[model samples]
Target: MRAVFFDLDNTLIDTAGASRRGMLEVIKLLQSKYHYKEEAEIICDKVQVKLSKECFHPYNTCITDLRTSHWEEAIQETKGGAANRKLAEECYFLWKSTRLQHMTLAEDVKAMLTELRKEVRLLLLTNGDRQTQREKIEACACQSYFDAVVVGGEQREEKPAPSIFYYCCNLLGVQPGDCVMVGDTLETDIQGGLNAGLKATVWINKNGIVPLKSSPVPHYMVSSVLELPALLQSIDCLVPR
Candidate 1:
């Protein structure tokens, strides 16, 4: 492959911890503002899973849609009698804006990316707002490793659709058949890469979670970025298409 495209959240970085912490902090802020006796921490923990499910949807909504849904859920869970919904909204923005700044990179991510840089052109293709994703990459000090960075918002199309993947390939001046996409999401990263006719797609299944029966299957599965160097070497040794 001439290039490799990476997904940002959950693949290269452990963003889940940061997101959970940020959400809890927001809950605490709302509790303090409204003096709710309900345990904000417990409520946040319960709501986090639900929020993640929505956030990871193949046709994920915008920040405004997410905020609206989150606020509605928070109000319902808190019995809609104590916490201010306005405060919840504010907290959500704060969390999204700052969470990435505190996110920790996954183990061996830097070393693997550095190694890959020597062999193939690398790019970051993520499905999110441009500014938000850019901020996260900058905060993680990973901006320099990528030759191109494509965000869903900028392309007007998110993953699971082939447009953005093809866009990234175009930006890199590489044919779709000459690139590989590596990421954690089967619906977006894997499916989109396949639809774009990429040479291969690797799924970073860290938790060993089984994909849904109907989801697109990745060409290779790895538990960590450390496995990537060897995988790339294997691909390189094989005859080119």
Candidate 2:
């Protein structure tokens, strides 16, 4: 491959894990200091329910504002219509800091990126609002590893759209046929790769999720991003590099 476009969120960083831990910390604070009568698990579940019910406008929605609302709703739900504005805001801030603290690049993933860099150009192509994505990128200090980093919010379009993918290829000065796309999500990453007509798309199915028939199929699959170096090597060997 002449270049590789990788997704950010769950592929390179354990965003979901960090988010879970952050919420857990909020729950702990709620029970320990506020002395909420509800069970910790119950409060957490209520927060998740609120999260699922919320609508997200990717370009305009501020994550911190959205999360603040979730906390407020959760607190009100747990307290039987009584909500503490200060306490909810405090919980939101706590979750934000704790999540940022936990969002870090793993050593092996770093080593793999180093190894891959020697063989081909590496680019980070992620879809999210600028501020939120930049915060995560800065927190993990992963920008140095990529030749170029493209965020969907910076462009006129987002993933699953051919235009944004073409924009990424143009930034790297690589043809779509010479680039590979790697990501954890099927809807955005894999589908975008397919839509862009890239050389190949690899899905990082870390959770071993079985794809439905209607799902967009990726050319290759692996359980973790750590397998990418070896997988790419094998692909290089099989095809004329």
Candidate 3:
């Protein structure tokens, strides 16, 4: 492949672990008042579902940042569906900032990028706000590994849209057929890449999630980012130099 686009969260960085840790901290932070799950891993799923219900809208229009909102309201739902706004804000900041601080390259991911960068182009195409996402790129020290980076906030639409993919291709001076999209989400990264007419797509199925019957299939699949170097090597050899 001429260029590679990777989804930022679970694909490149271990957001799953980071997010869980943050949620666990939040649970501890308010342990006296709340009786939510003690483990962040358990809190993580429940909190995300709460955020989705409270903050997410059918269309794009919603709060500027979902994290800063009182998503803890979900945690307090069992306690008569009420929560203190101030305390909720504190919980929000604690969870959001902790996750940001914990964001790091996925296991074996840094070395994989080091090797892959030598032969082919590399880019990070993620769906998130510009300021928040850029802060992540800088803090995680992943900016240096990528040839280009694209964020959803600066673009008209996010992933699952062909426009964003085509925008990155233009920046790399490559055709759609020359790049592969690697990401953990089937609905967004894989589907978006294919919809954009990319030559192939690689699904980072870190958890081995079986796709739904209606889900579109990816061209390749891997459970770890470490496997990408060899996979790309084979693909590169197949393509004429």
Estimated TM-score per prediction? Answer: 0.79, 0.90, 0.83
The runs of at least 3 residues in candidate 2 whose Cα sits more than 4 Å from the true structure, single-residue gaps closed, are 52-59, 81-83, 237-241
Worst 10 residues of 3 by lDDT: 55-64
Q: What is the C-alpha lDDT of each candidate?
A: 0.76, 0.85, 0.77
lDDT of 2 at 16: 88
Error of 3 at 116 (Å): 1.2
Model 3 per-residue lDDT tens digits across residues 152-231: 77788889999999999999999898889999998899999999999789998877888989998999999887777778
Per-residue lDDT, model 1, residue 136, is: 78
lDDT of candidate 2 over 29-140, digit per residue (tens)? 9789877655655767777777667544655767777778777877777665677678778988888889888999999989989878887889999887787789899999
Off by over 4 Å in 3: 32-46, 54-66, 75-83, 237-241
Predicted model with the maximum lDDT: 2
Query: Model 2 scores what on Cα lDDT?
Result: 0.85
Where does the lowest 10-residue lDDT sum fall in candidate 1? 54-63
> Which clashing pairs does model 3 show?
none
Model 3 TM-score relative to the real fold: 0.83
Tell me the spans in candidate 1 whose CA falls farther than 4 Å from its real position: 27-35, 42-69, 72-86, 237-241
Ranking of all predicted structures according to TM-score, beginning with the best and ending with the worst? 2, 3, 1
Comparison by TM-score, 1 against 3, better one: 3
